Amino acid sequence: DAPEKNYERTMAILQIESEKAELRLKELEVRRLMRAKGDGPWFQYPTIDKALIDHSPKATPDN
């Protein structure tokens, strides 16, 4: 292989791996903040569906 080929192939490898390492650190920080705050699409533990509530008039008024 030419020194140009090895050199530029090395630069492409280094770009891909630096992007992956920065993305791994960002993945760690995103998971930390989403577990802390719960305002993202991850760690959305379920609550009760409010469509299960009967909103009809009941037998007694005070409810």
Partner: protein, 171 residues
Amino acid sequence: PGIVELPSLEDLKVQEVKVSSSVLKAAAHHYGAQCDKPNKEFMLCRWEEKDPRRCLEEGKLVNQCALEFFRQIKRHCAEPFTEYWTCIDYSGLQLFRRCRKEQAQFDKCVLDKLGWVRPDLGELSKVTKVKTDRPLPENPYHSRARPEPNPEVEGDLKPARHGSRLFFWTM
């Protein structure tokens, strides 16, 4: 928290319908016939406000219209009504079915002297509409502001940037 507000004892004084349950049960069909409007304004206010403190005055109208219901019995047909609720009052389950001739005497004297038609089978269980002037409660549960929902997903789905990014797996 706060102090729960309660009305005074003068706000709760009304002339009570001081008659027995067999007396109420004897005249109950003509009561539901003739005392329709204030009773239904009260029960509409009672299921809508969900608060009896906001339903006192309408309730007083109930206790205003019930007494005038019984005075109008007492002025005209006291004896057939008395003969009827006594027979209702004998039964331990208070059967209407044991008391049909006294019911017929009371209904005859009421239709003659007051023009009242007894409700049929299926009438007093109707859902009727009520025209009141009081406004609709905009928050009957006194609920505070609901929390804002989480942001939904938008944007077109792109591939994963250089795959799994799991240690050395390039896909």
